[PDB]
């Protein structure tokens, strides 16, 4: 056993763990900054977690294991002096102007500055702020006037994606973070998934803003602005209005969007049902033609970029169905004018996404037809929250309203898209009915749900057995391929999400304090909202969506054929 003294208190423990973890488990406060995801910044450690160990001196609690005999002090003057000094030195390289800053209300660094009453020795007031900012990407932006060089984004990129597309760089003799060779992220192997943003404790990493695109369209007299939110938004955005975690705020969102001036309130879950119509039809076709196998989902643009950059030989195996965002957008410029009288050129289609990579997808040159973009702007969950707050809309006290039904109705299958395994489960519900020409009652595929990184199942479709896999996070895609797991059997249908947990954990989602992440499983609680909707919806299959059925009957025809196949599909070359 080990006997540990912390701040005069004796502990007897068998645990093999760090001082930081042991202290935290025993209600002893130790600050941290560069420690996250069970890693710290191994070179140029932040030292905010400093403690004193008798007989050794000052040590970093976050990467020092407890040893029998240690006597530790976490709150001596020497300790607080050192921590304050490191915060002061960070302020010397930080444009400390919180007023207009997009992390003003939830900044980890600000909290530490306040906790230790630190001040800069010489305030940093960049003039060529141009020099510190990189806005070239369609999805990410960097503001180095805020960057603490804490490495959390580099560590998060490595762990979440294994691309190491975010790097430390030596730029004219100063250390920065950025992409390979200081290129635009979009021109590197980066997936544009934004996990580096989620990991950042300050406003040094952000999404590429579309808020001006949106406001300009809202204010243009002749534009008719459609808005449609992703599955995950309704499970998440309430966090930023102090409503807590796991709160379903669907109806409040619809009201807020009307109060912001949007002209039509639809829902990307309608697009999710459309993607299932096309993709489940495609799966049945591929079964009847014995391939090609495996078919991969094509709805996650982080995964599409991963395939493009590392597995281009798989691009032809991706489903040709457009993603819910792009398939909805295509219909918003074709079907929707046909049922409304709008001039298609005057329709401006906005989505709200938990995702930064969706901005790149929407701006792909060929995601348009007859000069009309499928999707004209994409705002993240965070961006919508800012728009609501800037307009002084009292979100938490809004009454519930409904979407406009024509492209707004959704089934429970579409509702679960935002969780890892949701697309797989939704697609199987329709594919099995399609293949067996039946209306089956057992529709729940629990085996593909949850947070395991690589999940598989055998499913029986029309009296034959098929193998499916759900790949949960970009790093797990690499593991699945490089390990040869793909070779252990013939897989027929594989879901891939780049963000572990699915889109509920996407790079456009609300930041969560690392100490809130110790008390809340964010991936599970956000997903729970979506499964709950599925459980209480009357229609739980995409092909039972009444508004969608009318759309195919009256405009697109049979899925996966004819008109449907000509404009609702996309292949990467
Ligand atoms: S990143 Fe945090 S400390 Fe820095 S200016 Fe923004 S809110 Fe203030
Ligand atoms: S967007 Fe994703 S892949 Fe690109 S640097 Fe950030 S974490 Fe890495
Ligand atoms: S961008 Fe953010 S996470 Fe990355 S080193 Fe700078 S402060 Fe840390
Ligand atoms: S998992 Fe969802 S949020 Fe993450 S990159 Fe893919 S589409 Fe975007
Ligand atoms: S938090 Fe321990 S060195 Fe940064
Ligand atoms: Cl309508
Ligand atoms: Mg370390
Ligand atoms: Mg307007």
Author numbering: 1 to 573
Sentences from the paper on this structure:
pmcHydrogenases are metalloenzymes that catalyze the interconversion between protons (H+), electrons (e−) and hydrogen (H2). Among them, [FeFe]‐hydrogenases exhibit the highest activity for both H2 production and oxidation. Their catalytic cofactor, termed H‐cluster, consists of a [4Fe4S] sub‐cluster ([4Fe]H) and a diiron moiety ([2Fe]H) bridged through a cysteine residue. The amine base is connected to the protein surface through a conserved proton transfer pathway (PTP) for rapid H+ shuttling.
Two crystals of 1.39 Å and 1.5 Å, termed CpI‐CN−‐1 and CpI‐CN−‐2 in the following, were analyzed in depth. They were compared to two structures of CO‐treated CpI for which we obtained higher resolutions (1.34 Å and 1.52 Å; termed Hox‐CO‐1 and Hox‐CO‐2 hereafter) than previously reported. The four newly obtained structures feature strong electron densities at the OCS at Fed that are not present in the structure of untreated CpI. The refined occupancies indicate that the OCS is fully occupied by an extrinsic ligand in CN−‐treated CpI, whereas only 71 to 93 % of the OCS of CO‐treated crystals hold an extrinsic ligand. The latter is possibly due to an insufficient partial pressure of CO in the crystallization wells. CO binds to the OCS of the H‐cluster, and CO and CN− are isoelectronic, making it challenging to distinguish them by electron density analysis. To the best of our knowledge, conformational changes of PTP residues have never been observed in structures of untreated CpI wild type proteins. They are also absent from three independently prepared structures obtained by CO treatment as well as from the sulfide (SH−) ‐bound Desulfovibrio desulfuricans [FeFe]‐hydrogenase.
